[PDB]
Ligand binder design. Sequence first.
Ligand code: HEM
Length: 84
Amino acid sequence: KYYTLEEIQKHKDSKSTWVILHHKVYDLTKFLEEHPGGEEVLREQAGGDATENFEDVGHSTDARELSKTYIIGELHPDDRSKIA
Ligand code: HEM
Protein backbone atom coordinates (compact mmCIF):
# COMPACT_ATOMS: atom_id res chain seq x y z
CA LYS A 1 0.00 0.00 0.00
CA TYR A 2 1.26 3.51 -0.71
CA TYR A 3 1.72 6.33 1.84
CA THR A 4 2.81 9.95 1.27
CA LEU A 5 5.70 11.76 2.98
CA GLU A 6 3.03 13.80 4.84
CA GLU A 7 1.53 10.84 6.75
CA ILE A 8 5.01 9.35 7.17
CA GLN A 9 6.41 12.61 8.68
CA LYS A 10 3.47 12.82 11.14
CA HIS A 11 4.18 9.25 12.31
CA LYS A 12 7.49 10.03 14.05
CA ASP A 13 6.90 8.83 17.55
CA SER A 14 4.41 7.77 20.25
CA LYS A 15 1.85 5.25 18.99
CA SER A 16 2.81 5.83 15.29
CA THR A 17 6.56 5.55 14.56
CA TRP A 18 7.01 4.63 10.89
CA VAL A 19 10.22 4.39 8.82
CA ILE A 20 10.78 4.26 5.03
CA LEU A 21 13.21 1.30 4.84
CA HIS A 22 14.42 0.39 1.32
CA HIS A 23 11.21 1.80 -0.12
CA LYS A 24 8.99 -0.03 2.38
CA VAL A 25 7.01 1.37 5.30
CA TYR A 26 7.24 -0.51 8.56
CA ASP A 27 5.50 0.78 11.56
CA LEU A 28 7.76 0.24 14.56
CA THR A 29 5.62 1.93 17.27
CA LYS A 30 6.67 -0.69 19.90
CA PHE A 31 10.13 -1.88 18.84
CA LEU A 32 11.35 1.53 20.11
CA GLU A 33 11.41 -0.11 23.58
CA GLU A 34 13.00 -3.34 22.26
CA HIS A 35 15.93 -2.29 20.00
CA PRO A 36 19.36 -2.63 21.72
CA GLY A 37 20.00 0.97 20.73
CA GLY A 38 16.58 1.99 22.14
CA GLU A 39 14.32 4.72 20.81
CA GLU A 40 16.72 7.60 19.93
CA VAL A 41 18.17 6.18 16.69
CA LEU A 42 14.71 5.06 15.48
CA ARG A 43 12.94 8.19 16.66
CA GLU A 44 15.34 10.64 14.98
CA GLN A 45 14.85 8.88 11.60
CA ALA A 46 11.13 8.19 12.08
CA GLY A 47 8.69 9.58 9.54
CA GLY A 48 11.90 9.76 7.46
CA ASP A 49 13.92 8.19 4.62
CA ALA A 50 15.55 5.88 7.12
CA THR A 51 16.47 3.41 4.26
CA GLU A 52 20.01 4.73 4.37
CA ASN A 53 20.71 5.42 8.08
CA PHE A 54 19.22 1.94 8.62
CA GLU A 55 21.20 -0.25 6.24
CA ASP A 56 24.41 1.85 6.20
CA VAL A 57 24.55 1.68 10.04
CA GLY A 58 26.57 -1.56 9.80
CA HIS A 59 23.41 -3.60 10.49
CA SER A 60 23.87 -7.38 10.36
CA THR A 61 21.76 -9.01 7.60
CA ASP A 62 19.55 -10.37 10.45
CA ALA A 63 18.36 -6.82 11.23
CA ARG A 64 17.44 -6.49 7.54
CA GLU A 65 15.76 -9.90 7.17
CA LEU A 66 13.19 -9.38 9.95
CA SER A 67 12.58 -5.97 8.35
CA LYS A 68 10.62 -7.60 5.48
CA THR A 69 8.34 -9.42 7.99
CA TYR A 70 6.23 -6.33 8.84
CA ILE A 71 5.43 -4.14 5.77
CA ILE A 72 2.45 -1.81 6.09
CA GLY A 73 3.31 -0.27 2.68
CA GLU A 74 5.82 0.87 -0.01
CA LEU A 75 5.25 4.63 -0.73
CA HIS A 76 3.60 7.03 -3.18
CA PRO A 77 5.24 7.01 -6.67
CA ASP A 78 6.78 10.49 -6.18
CA ASP A 79 8.36 10.13 -2.73
CA ARG A 80 10.13 7.23 -4.51
CA SER A 81 12.69 9.85 -5.73
CA LYS A 82 13.16 11.69 -2.38
CA ILE A 83 14.77 8.62 -0.74
CA ALA A 84 18.27 9.11 -2.22
C1 HEM B 1 13.76 -3.33 11.87
C2 HEM B 1 14.11 -3.43 13.17
C3 HEM B 1 15.56 -3.47 13.58
C4 HEM B 1 16.18 -4.53 14.19
C5 HEM B 1 15.58 -5.87 14.57
C6 HEM B 1 17.51 -4.09 14.53
C7 HEM B 1 18.46 -4.92 15.12
C8 HEM B 1 19.72 -4.48 15.51
C9 HEM B 1 20.73 -5.34 16.07
C10 HEM B 1 20.65 -6.84 16.25
C11 HEM B 1 21.83 -4.56 16.34
C12 HEM B 1 23.11 -5.03 16.99
C13 HEM B 1 24.15 -5.55 15.98
C14 HEM B 1 25.34 -6.21 16.67
O1 HEM B 1 25.36 -6.21 17.92
O2 HEM B 1 26.21 -6.73 15.93
C15 HEM B 1 21.52 -3.21 15.90
C16 HEM B 1 22.40 -2.14 16.01
C17 HEM B 1 22.09 -0.82 15.64
N1 HEM B 1 20.93 -0.36 15.07
FE1 HEM B 1 19.23 -1.55 14.63
N2 HEM B 1 17.61 -2.76 14.21
C18 HEM B 1 16.44 -2.32 13.62
C19 HEM B 1 16.13 -1.04 13.16
C20 HEM B 1 17.00 0.06 13.30
C21 HEM B 1 16.74 1.38 12.78
C22 HEM B 1 15.55 1.82 11.95
C23 HEM B 1 17.80 2.16 13.15
C24 HEM B 1 17.93 3.64 12.88
C25 HEM B 1 18.02 4.13 11.62
C26 HEM B 1 18.78 1.35 13.83
C27 HEM B 1 20.03 1.81 14.27
C28 HEM B 1 21.01 0.98 14.85
C29 HEM B 1 22.29 1.43 15.35
C30 HEM B 1 22.78 2.85 15.46
C31 HEM B 1 22.97 0.31 15.82
C32 HEM B 1 24.39 0.27 16.37
C33 HEM B 1 24.81 1.41 17.31
C34 HEM B 1 26.10 1.07 18.06
O3 HEM B 1 26.95 0.39 17.45
O4 HEM B 1 26.20 1.50 19.23
N3 HEM B 1 18.24 0.09 13.90
N4 HEM B 1 20.24 -3.22 15.42
